[PDB]
Amino acid sequence: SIQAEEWYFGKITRRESERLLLNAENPRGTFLVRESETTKGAYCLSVSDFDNAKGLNVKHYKIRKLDSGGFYITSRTQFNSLQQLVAYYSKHADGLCHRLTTVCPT
Numbered sequence: 260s261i262q263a264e265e266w267y268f269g270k271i272t273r274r275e276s277e278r279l280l281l282n283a284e285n286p287r288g289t290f291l292v293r294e295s296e297t298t299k300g301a302y303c304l305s306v307s308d309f310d311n312a313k314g315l316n317v318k319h320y321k322i323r324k325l326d327s328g329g330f331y332i333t334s335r336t337q338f339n340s341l342q343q344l345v346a347y348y349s350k351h352a353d354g355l356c357h358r359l360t361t362v363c364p365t
């Protein structure tokens with residue numbers, strides 16, 4: 260049950276996700292998962308980042324879900340659940356702008 264997850268914001272827009280994440284109190288890695296505005300069945304992982312170049316900014320990654328059961332951002336690294344995916348990206352930055360650190364505050 261993904262909607263039970265505190266990091267799951269469900270049906271919110273891309274603009275809303277960025278409004279929530281662009282708060283100055285948010286450290287790098289602040290994140291949320293929401294439905295994709297356009298892609299049916301896909302989820303979107305929105306993550307805050309920060310650097311002296313760009314300052315505070317937001318990145319979006321598409322989370323695909325296979326009828327065959329797997330969840331993934333890259334087909335090479337798949338998970339049995341969205342929860343396991345989130346747990347894995349909280350420790351490995353891999354190709355993400357930062358590892359997932361803190362759930363986005365409302």
Ligand SMILES: *C(=O)c1cc(C)cc(C=O)c1OP(=O)(O)O
Nearest residue numbers: 273295296297302303319320321
């Ligand atoms: C998430 O589904 C998503 C992923 C990327 C790489 C980009 C964007 C847009 O900024 C996404 O949001 P979406 O609402 O699906 O367009």
